[PDB]
Design a protein around this ligand. Structure first.
Ligand SMILES: [Zn+2]
Ligand SMILES: [Zn+2]
Ligand SMILES: [Zn+2]
Lengths: 231, 28, 59, 100, 614, 107, 47, 167, 259
């Protein structure tokens, strides 16, 4: 039942909301390929400009609302760059949360925004850096997942079909289908190999960390006994 | 064995009669 | 015979039937017969002409 | 007769309540892959039932290729009723929707 | 499916409920009383499972609608059970309500204020308001009746206000809001309610103890005798009654206990048994858990299975005949009971005869519904529960999945001369697979030839459908009749009732058609694509291009593929624009290609595009 | 197309008043009259229909079965396109004493 | 557990809104996904 | 391909008898079966054709046991066996052998003695087939893209050994 | 609750609007105007002219035929209006199309003029034919009416015509005039053409429970003639098996022995 609604959100068969936006950007995977291939798109500017015909769209969309907002979010993002995630500003939320991607040119994912802006800075090259920005903004607009798309079946098929390739045995932790079953199929509270990844500081040396490993590792009486003589 | 699978038009997605059935043998 | 393209799905009286005078019936008949005359409907108009004829004259 | 008039009033009231006016509509100006597929299929179905065609079918025998030609000249007289998860809808004509 | 046959009415929702005995008796076409199915000579016996009132059987016309075996839809009948029986599916539930109720005041042993608290919470949950159901627990003032009744009043006041407030806004409709989280909160409460209900030993309303009820695998209940501590408790609390004015228990006794309890506790059960508000205002009766009658399905769904020459008896009729034998026997036992009595004393025998009569019909009822609830007979006959869950189940084997018309299967063979979006169809399939093409002015020329060509010459036609709805097969006809029918395709309809319609030609699959190619297992939607038909002469196998090898995960090692031929333009458009091969270049798994050339073509390219190649 | 249209697509009669496919039946008409789809559940036995002043049945409301029994009402029947397994399922559920009510629009 | 879920449905007096792909297939209704996520209406000229 | 069928009349008093009953005889059956009711050894049979004939007194009608298979055949052997009796002898058991001709069809598997099996993709004409300097066109064509994955070098040495031994 | 459930049934068969006797004519006005709502199908051939569709398809076969819902004979329709599926100024409306077929379905509003004659209503008709057991009449020279022998007064005596047919004579002793006034006893819809069963003779007839006691003699005449008509009709189109005796003799069934 899970599909794309006309309000771009991922809704179940009964109308209950599952996601507010597909992957947080509403992009169709079968389109997200050359969307970061900026040099390719630049070498084929006029070819793609003719493909994504904007002349029959300029009257149906907004060209500034989202673009202005995108700068305001980028402003507060750069202000708290060194700051941690909990201390980050919550004044302006993403441009995709406030503007419909199919109606506002510029309501693009911050991931795409950062990647596109980085290309225009690191590469100074009859195409202007401003008219190329619009083409890529338009490419993202034309790369959106269609309302009605059964993202539910597609997701399970995208997890199922390649999990056939991992039917072969190990060459410690649970892998392949048994591990996938522990998650998706049984949601086990009693995992076969429960683990914890502990990030060690820089001020703690390789010898200190190994001594710490010994300090937590379970020690049995058997492990310290050499011989037992019963007379 | 593949000749029988070559002619049969599957009812569904294989069968859980293996380890999955013994995992389902746990009541809440 | 008795299909979706022949007969309607549902018929409902939107209001109670309001009685019409002899002159109103005759005014309607004249209006309906003239509009329809302007294939199996022809036999129904033929019968309708007899009612109109009875409401003002003799057969 | 009295109980039906109330039922009809409620039916039409709920319909109007769900209808999103032409100005307040906020879905994609683009015709979805699914909309195009159904429009071409439904119009082809109409063409096969001797429906008045608004294009010159120069030796065309396939109703779908006729429905495709009518789409190219935006002569398909159909409307898409885009439903939202609450039951409300946006009526979009085939003419106004952008086709790739 | 016919486009010439549109439907004006549609099912918008399905409501689940229980059939009442009074309801079945009125709709019934005939009362079934006879265990025999056929009279002598071979005619169905009156009052038996093959009665003609249940539908047309043995070249006889139906005695209800008058139609023959083809047009008769079949009619439901009924068996009058001489004593009520526990419905197997709802036995566990009626058992819960039997153990939870007091046998004296005939209320649930849980305190009325606590029961009302659940009724309040469950009423607020009929509408989508969980926050309010929890806020009810905040309403707080061995406790006097005048004080507890004020708590019930204040709680009812909050419930009526919270519903009206949310009803004023778009928070909940008159039909009530229902979500999965709302359903989760309901399921939690209905569970907690039954848990609290079963936990109480001594009745909180009237302090008298009730005798505990035990159960076995089969639908049968027993009453365990009270201990001396609880018997003396009944005596001391016996005077307060006056001022206000293991042994097997029969189905009637249980029904009579639950009858009063479901009347006295109607308020809570109203919301315990209704997911959304009860707008129908129907009473929640205990007799829904009991069966006073059995519906006899139409003869149409109980036909004897024919395998070659041998005609085998239907397993349902066998189980139904067993219910009929026991019913006639209890009718005689009750008739002998009615005869005699002044002489009694040893009444241990009359109850023993009654217990047998009750347990025997119950078993026959159980055997018919769910076999895994019936006693072992020296493999048993499957019940209706077993019929819905034979293997994968009726839902999985015949609803979610189905065997289809206008489809073919064949071993795939490679072909680099056909398009990457095409399928090489053998002429064998092309002369059998047909499309219902409606005849019009733009295609009269194309279809006239197909009609002349007939069902064995491609591109031909196997049949022609007139506007009256009738079919004219072109199979037996010679070129002369086919030529005459072709010159009669675009003739105007004389009948005004079919003037809207036009003739149809069931034409052979042409090279412009769409087909659904399928290679099992269909692990991803790319394993079921739309291909363009290319009829290849002198072929006995399905020809497929090498670019399709990846998506289907099909190797030409003697693999088999299914070909589906959709029969309408909406299904055509879908197979040509959505599920078509060209629109499946990139898989949605990683957005990477699954289409390309595989072996000779790669080695050919390295040589062709080499500098040395002039 | 696969799971319904080219499998078990059946245009079946349903009563709008009680929402069922199994109570509907074709009425048995007289020499000149036409057969009409009638619901056995919603229709009342002619004799049982007893009676401000006396009321008269509009003739179009009285239908007869093959057994010769007269019935009053149960004429609010329509046609719906459904899979045939549904009819077999409803029939099986009915044996178990379970009733399916199909809410059919228009009403 | 078809009969078990059916029992729970009857006891709840549940209304199947026929909005899930499975439910729609059971009653022969067009699936609400993709091409079934909207309605097609014909524009007619005469009043 | 040879297939054998046992036509036994057992299902103690003899009712079914091999042959043809008097007064009752459905049209053109004598084309497949001989006077004894058994088929003519060598006769072409398709599904529906009579493979034997008998008469049972219980139904007082002349019935036939039909041949049914998608592949047509020819009768190779008909053997009458009247065993499991001392003095009361009468035939009830007959064994019929079918000869089904099987030309190599598109789909049939072929393999070298090196585990290199492949289905018949097509029966390529000699004019369209590649022709050698000697004037020989290969009987079988194996694709070179089979060998890099299978690593069946035994077949490669078998090729130059077989050629050397033929010359 | 005992009478509450039965109360819903009475209102279902309750006569909405009764036909009143006016202008000292003595006859009750049965032609009435009733506004209705239809749910009709629209053929794709009528997609450019939808009003002509609804008319030729569903409203035209409706006229001069009895419609059960309006409770009378549709004499015609007036003011057809298609309800737009889109709630909104223009003549261009929209109709919802079925997902499976190209046909659309719409709600329509039209006023029907129907001939609604209830029982007890006094009507006039021109005598068409007059047999020994019934009198044929025509209401407005279009609607069929019949008065059975038992519904004719006892004082009346029928006379058979010799050499080209018959004629009925009233109580006074003179033949009956071209037009005849009668009361509606019953209205038969189920058949091909609408037929009105009429009476020429018309609670407090009880003389110590005498009304409850039926006169077998009079009750027989109305039952025998009814059965005789039903049995003669059932014998029409009756195929019986040809029986041939074990001699080669065909058994011929004929009540009359001689020619
Ligand atoms: Zn029947
Ligand atoms: Zn108590
Ligand atoms: Zn009904």
């Amino acid at each position: 039942g899970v599909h794309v609604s006309y309000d771009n959100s991922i809704r179940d068969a009964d109308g209950t909301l599952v996601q507010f936006m597909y992957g947080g950007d509403a992009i169709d995977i079968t389109k997200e390929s050359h969307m970061t291939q900026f040099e390719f798109c630049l070498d084929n500017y006029y070819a793609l400009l003719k493909k994504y015909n904007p002349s029959a769209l300029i009257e149906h969309l907004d060209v500034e609302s989202a673009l202005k907002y995108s700068k305001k979010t980028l402003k507060y993002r750069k202000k708290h760059s060194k700051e941690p995630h909990y201390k980050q500003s919550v004044k302006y939320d993403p441009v995709l949360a406030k503007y419909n991607p199919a109606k506002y040119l510029g309501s693009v994912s911050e991931n795409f925004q950062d990647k596109l802006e980085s290309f225009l800075d690191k590469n100074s090259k009859g195409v202007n850096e401003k008219k190329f920005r619009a083409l890529m903004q338009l490419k993202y607009m034309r790369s959106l997942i269609n309302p009605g798309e059964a993202v539910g079946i597609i997701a399970s098929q995208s997890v199922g079909e390649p999990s056939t390739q991992m039917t072969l045995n190990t060459f410690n932790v649970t892998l392949g289908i048994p591990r996938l079953r522990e998650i998706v199929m049984t949601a086990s509270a009693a995992i076969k190999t429960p683990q914890m990844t502990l990030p060690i500081w820089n001020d703690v040396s390789d010898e200190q960390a190994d001594t710490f490993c010994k300090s937590i590792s379970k020690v049995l009486l058997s492990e310290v006994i050499d011989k037992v003589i019963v007379t | 064995e593949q000749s029988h699978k070559k002619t049969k038009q599957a009812v569904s997605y294989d069968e859980p009669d293996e380890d999955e059935i013994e995992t389902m043998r746990e009541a809440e | 015979s008795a299909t979706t393209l022949n007969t309607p799905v549902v018929i409902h009286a939107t209001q109670l039937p309001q009685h019409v005078s002899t002159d109103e019936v005759l005014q309607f008949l004249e209006s309906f017969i003239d509009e329809k005359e302007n294939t199996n409907l022809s036999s129904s108009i033929s019968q309708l002409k007899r009612i109109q004829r009875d409401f003002k004259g003799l057969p | 007769p009295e109980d039906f008039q109330q039922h009809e009033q409620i039916r039409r009231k709920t319909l109007k309540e769900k209808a999103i006016p032409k100005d307040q509509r906020a879905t994609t100006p683009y015709m979805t892959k699914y909309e195009r597929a159904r429009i071409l299929g439904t119009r082809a179905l109409q063409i096969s039932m001797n429906a008045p065609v608004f294009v010159d079918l120069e030796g065309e025998t396939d109703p779908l290729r006729i429905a495709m030609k009518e789409l190219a000249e935006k002569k398909i007289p159909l409307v898409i009723r885009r439903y939202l998860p609450d039951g409300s809808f946006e009526d979009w004509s085939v003419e106004e929707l952008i086709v790739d | 499916m016919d486009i010439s046959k549109p439907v004006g009415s549609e099912i918008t929702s399905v409501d689940f409920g229980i059939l009442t005995a009074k309801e079945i008796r009125n709709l019934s076409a005939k009362q079934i009383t006879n265990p025999t199915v056929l009279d002598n000579l071979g005619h169905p016996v009156s009052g038996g499972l093959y009665d003609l009132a249940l539908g047309a059987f043995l070249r006889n016309l139906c005695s209800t609608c008058g139609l023959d075996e083809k047009f008769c839809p079949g009619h439901q009948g009924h068996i009058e059970l001489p004593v009520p029986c526990y419905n197997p599916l709802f036995f566990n539930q009626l058992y819960i309500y039997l153990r939870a109720s007091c046998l004296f005041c005939h209320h649930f042993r849980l305190k009325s204020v606590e029961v009302h608290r659940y009724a309040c919470k469950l009423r607020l949950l009929q509408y989508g308001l969980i926050d309010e159901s929890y806020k009810l627990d905040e309403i707080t003032l061995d406790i006097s009746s005048t004080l507890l009744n004020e708590l019930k009043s204040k709680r009812s006041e909050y419930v009526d206000m919270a519903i009206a407030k949310a009803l004023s806004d778009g928070r909940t409709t008159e039909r009530g809001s229902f979500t999965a989280t709302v359903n989760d909160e309901r399921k939690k409460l209905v569970h907690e309610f039954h848990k609290k209900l079963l936990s109480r030993g001594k009745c909180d309303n009237c302090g008298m103890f009730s005798p505990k009820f035990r159960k076995d695998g089969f639908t049968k209940i027993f009453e365990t005798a009270l201990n001396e501590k609880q018997i003396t408790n009944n005596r001391v609390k016996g005077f307060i009654r006056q001022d206000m004015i293991s042994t097997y228990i029969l189905s009637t006794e249980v029904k009579n206990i639950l009858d009063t309890v479901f009347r006295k506790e109607q308020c809570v059960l109203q919301y315990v048994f209704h997911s959304r508000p009860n707008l129908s205002r129907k009473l929640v009766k205990a007799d829904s858990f009991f069966m006073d009658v059995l519906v006899v399905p139409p003869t149409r769904f109980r036909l004897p299975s024919k395998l070659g020459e041998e005609v085998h008896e239907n397993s349902q009729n066998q189980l139904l005949s067993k219910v009929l034998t026991t019913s006639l026997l209890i009718r005689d036992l009750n008739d002998d009971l009615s005869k005699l009595k002044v002489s009694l004393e040893d009444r241990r025998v009359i109850f023993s005869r009654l217990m047998n009569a009750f347990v025997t019909i119950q078993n026959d009822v159980n055997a018919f519904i769910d076999s895994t609830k019936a006693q072992g007979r020296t493999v048993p006959i499957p019940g209706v529960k077993q019929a819905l869950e034979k293997k994968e189940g009726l839902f999985r084997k015949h609803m979610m999945g189905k065997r289809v018309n206008y489809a073919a299967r064949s071993v795939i063979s490679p072909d680099p001369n056909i398009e990457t979006n095409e399928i090489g169809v053998p002429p064998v399939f092309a002369v059998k697979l047909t499309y219902p093409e409606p005849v019009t002015a733009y295609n009269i020329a194309e279809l006239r030839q197909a009609v002349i060509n007939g069902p064995d010459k491609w591109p031909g036609a196997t049949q022609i459908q007139n506007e009256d709805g009738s079919l004219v097969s072109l199979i037996g006809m010679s070129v002369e009749q086919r030529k005459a029918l072709a010159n009669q395709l675009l003739t105007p309809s004389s009948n005004v009732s079919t003037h809207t319609l036009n003739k149809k030609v069931y034409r052979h699959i042409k090279n412009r058609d769409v087909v659904l190619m399928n290679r099992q297992p269909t692990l991803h939607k790319a394993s079921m694509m739309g291909h363009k038909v290319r009829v290849l002469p002198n072929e006995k196998t399905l020809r497929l291009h090498y670019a399709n090898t990846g998506a289907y995960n099909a190797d030409f090692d003697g693999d088999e593929m299914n070909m589906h031929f959709p029969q309408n333009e909406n299904a055509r458009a879908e197979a040509l624009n959505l599920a078509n091969t060209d629109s499946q270049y990139l898989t949605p798994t990683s957005g990477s290609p699954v289409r390309g050339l595989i072996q000779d073509h790669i080695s050919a390219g390295v040589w062709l595009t080499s500098k040395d190649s002039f | 197309d696969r799971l319904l249209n080219s499998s078990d697509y059946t245009q079946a009669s349903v009563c709008r008043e009680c929402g069922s496919i199994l109570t509907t039946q074709q009425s048995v008409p007289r020499i000149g009259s036409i057969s009409t789809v009638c619901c056995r559940r919603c229709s009342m036995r002619f004799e049982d229909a007893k009676k401000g002043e006396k009321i008269f049945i509009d003739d179009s409301q009285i239908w007869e079965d093959g057994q010769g029994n007269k019935f009053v009402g149960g004429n609010e029947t329509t046609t719906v396109a459904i899979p045939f397994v549904l009819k077999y399922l409803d029939s099986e559920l009915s044996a178990m004493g379970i009733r399916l009510r199909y809410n059919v629009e228009p009403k | 557990t078809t009969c078990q879920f059916l029992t729970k449905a009857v006891l709840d007096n549940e209304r199947e809104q026929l909005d899930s792909p499975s439910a729609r297939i059971v009653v022969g209704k067009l699936n609400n996904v993709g091409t079934g996520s909207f309605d097609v209406l014909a524009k007619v000229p005469n009043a | 391909m040879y297939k054998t069928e046992k036509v036994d009349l057992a299902l103690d008093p003899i009712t079914q008898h091999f042959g043809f009953g008097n007064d009752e005889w459905p049209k053109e059956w004598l084309e497949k079966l001989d006077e004894d009711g058994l088929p003519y050894i060598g006769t072409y049979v398709e599904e529906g054709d009579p493979i034997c004939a008998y008469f049972d007194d219980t139904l007082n009608k002349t019935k036939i046991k039909t041949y049914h298979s998608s592949e047509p055949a020819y009768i190779e052997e008909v053997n009458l066996i009247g065993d499991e009796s001392n003095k009361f002898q009468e035939l009830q058991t007959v064994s019929i052998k079918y000869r089904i001709r099987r030309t190599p069809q598109i789909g049939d598997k072929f393999s070298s003695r090196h585990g290199q099996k492949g289905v018949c993709s097509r029966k390529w004409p000699t004019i369209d087939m590649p022709f050698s300097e000697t004037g020989i066109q290969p009987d079988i064509i194996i694709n070179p893209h089979a060998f890099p994955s299978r690593m069946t070098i035994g077949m490669f040495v078998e090729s130059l050994a077989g050629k050397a031994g033929a010359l | 609750n005992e009478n509450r459930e039965t109360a819903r049934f009475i209102k279902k068969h309750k006569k909405q609007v009764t036909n009143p006797i006016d202008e000292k004519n003595g006859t009750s006005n049965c032609i009435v105007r009733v506004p209705i709502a239809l749910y009709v199908s629209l053929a794709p051939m009528y997609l450019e002219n939808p009003l002509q569709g609804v008319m030729k398809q569903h409203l035209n076969p409706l006229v001069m035929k009895y419609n059960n819902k309006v409770g009378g004979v549709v004499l015609g329709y007036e003011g057809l209006k298609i309800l737009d599926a889109d709630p909104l100024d223009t003549s261009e409306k929209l109709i919802k199309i079925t997902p499976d077929t190209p046909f659309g379905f719409t709600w329509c509003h039209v006023n029907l003029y129907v001939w609604q004659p209830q029982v007890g209503d006094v009507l006039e008709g021109y005598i068409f034919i007059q047999s020994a057991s019934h009198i044929g009449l025509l209401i407005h020279d279009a609607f069929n009416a019949s008065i059975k022998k038992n519904n004719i007064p006892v004082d009346w005596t029928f006379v058979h015509n010799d050499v080209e047919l018959g004629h009925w004579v009233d109580s006074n002793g003179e033949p009956i005039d071209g037009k005849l006034r009668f009361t509606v006893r019953n209205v038969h819809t189920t058949g091909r053409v609408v037929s009105v069963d009429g009476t020429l003779i018309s609670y407090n007839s009880s003389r110590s429970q005498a009304e409850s006691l039926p006169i077998v003699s009079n009750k027989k005449i109305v039952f025998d003639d009814e059965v005789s008509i039903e049995n003669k009709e059932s014998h029409k189109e009756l195929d019986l098996p040809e029986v041939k005796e074990d001699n080669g003799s065909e058994i011929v069934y004929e009540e009359n022995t001689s020619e």
